[PDB]
């Protein structure tokens, strides 16, 4: 039964990424006063399969000055992490019920720098290494707030578990409080996923590797929006209606993933220096201040949460 559960978890998220590609294209088109894909299949639902076939049918021109080891284990690692992140997620009951689950998320997210850096060091150049260093620095820098935000918001629920946030928001979202922490969390998800306006790394791989990188990217997108939904937009949980919880979670995650593309179409890009100034001069001060605020709140209020 467990292998069946694993299949039910993995297959749909991959399908959902493959179709999130199409949703992005169509939304950007309609925002640009055009349609997008209409032909290959009814409304385009065959275009992702077409593209997958095309890529995987191309011929890989593997750079000659390179290392096959780091050439193969970079996208393998990326996809492995992007899939193993979806495991602990309570939807509402999790495939693997972990304590310290958000910490597992932090770590398995921070482990992608290794691939995004080995790819560059493998490609024998200096421009690719420059780009890789810069992207690594960006991702690293934003991991700091990605961590502190949770460190401060996990004091309204005294546990690092994801199955406690359901009862923590059994009456009210964690957005009304910490809406300044969300606005800083919703963005570090863009910069972490190198998503516009933070795409200074994609604005040098064969068909298969490029496809794996694409899959990892969009999977991480869906997952970050799912974390937002679970944490700051706690859906409904009636003990007998996991169906209800899952429906609401899906709706909110789709809202968020469409907001990402809304933004991509709406705004220009950033400049690496200004992108780093943003964090190190606007997000870290406010983050530390609100961290102290949220360490004091449960004290000068008698609302310090429990450890079950």
């Amino acid at each position: 039964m467990f292998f069946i559960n694993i299949l039910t978890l993995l297959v749909p998220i991959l399908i959902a990424m493959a179709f999130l590609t199409l949703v992005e294209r169509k939304i950007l088109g309609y925002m640009q006063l055009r349609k997008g894909p209409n032909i290959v299949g009814p409304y385009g639902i065959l275009q992702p399969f077409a593209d997958a076939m095309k890529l995987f049918m191309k011929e890989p021109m593997r750079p000659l000055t390179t290392s096959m080891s780091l050439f193969i284990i970079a996208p393998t690692l990326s996809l492995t992490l992007a899939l193993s992140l979806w495991v602990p997620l309570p939807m509402p009951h999790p495939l693997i019920n972990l304590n310290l689950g958000i910490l597992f998320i932090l770590a398995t997210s921070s482990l992608s720098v290794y691939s995004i850096l080995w790819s560059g060091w493998a490609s024998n150049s200096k421009y690719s290494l420059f780009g890789a260093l810069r992207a690594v620095a960006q991702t690293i820098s934003y991991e700091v707030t990605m961590a502190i935000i949770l460190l401060s918001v996990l004091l309204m629920n005294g546990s690092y578990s994801l199955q406690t946030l359901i009862t923590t928001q059994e009456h009210m979202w964690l957005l009304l409080p910490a809406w300044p922490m969300a606005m800083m969390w919703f963005i570090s998800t863009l910069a972490e996923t190198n998503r516009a306006p933070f795409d200074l790394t994609e604005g040098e791989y064969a068909a298969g590797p490029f496809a794996l990188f694409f899959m990892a990217e969009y999977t991480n997108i869906i997952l970050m929006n799912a974390l937002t939904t679970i944490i700051f937009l706690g859906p409904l949980y009636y003990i007998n209606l996991p169906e209800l919880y899952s429906t609401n979670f899906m709706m909110e995650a789709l809202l968020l993933s469409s907001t990402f593309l809304w933004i991509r179409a709406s705004y220009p890009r950033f400049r690496y220096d200004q992108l780093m100034h943003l964090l190190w001069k606007n997000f870290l001060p406010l983050t530390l201040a609100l961290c102290m605020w949220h360490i004091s709140l449960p004290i000068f209020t008698a609302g310090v949460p429990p450890y079950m």
């Binding site: 606007n282 406010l286 530390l288 201040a289 102290m292 004091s296 000068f300 008698a302 310090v304």
Partner: protein
């Protein structure tokens, strides 16, 4: 008063983020002394029974300790409910 208030308005216009950070810092360090609901935190975290209450011998001279959970000679945290 005037000079410093003009400085604060200049800041409030130029770098509101720094102002907000410092003011939240101050609120954090100050409110826990104003609030009356502070003590209750230690009170509760003490009242939580993560261990077994090992009893003691009835050696005669101990009138202010009960012989049964349902006696009023011991502590009673009805203030938690009333909270």
């Amino acid at each position: 008063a005037g000079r410093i208030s003009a400085f604060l308005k200049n800041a409030w216009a130029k770098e509101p983020v720094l102002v907000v950070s410092f003011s939240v810092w101050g609120l954090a360090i100050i409110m826990p002394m104003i609030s009356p609901y502070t003590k209750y935190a230690s009170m509760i975290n003490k009242a939580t029974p993560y261990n077994y209450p090992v009893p003691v011998r009835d050696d005669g001279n101990m009138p202010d300790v009960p012989s049964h959970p349902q006696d009023p000679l011991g502590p009673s945290l009805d203030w938690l409910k009333n909270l």
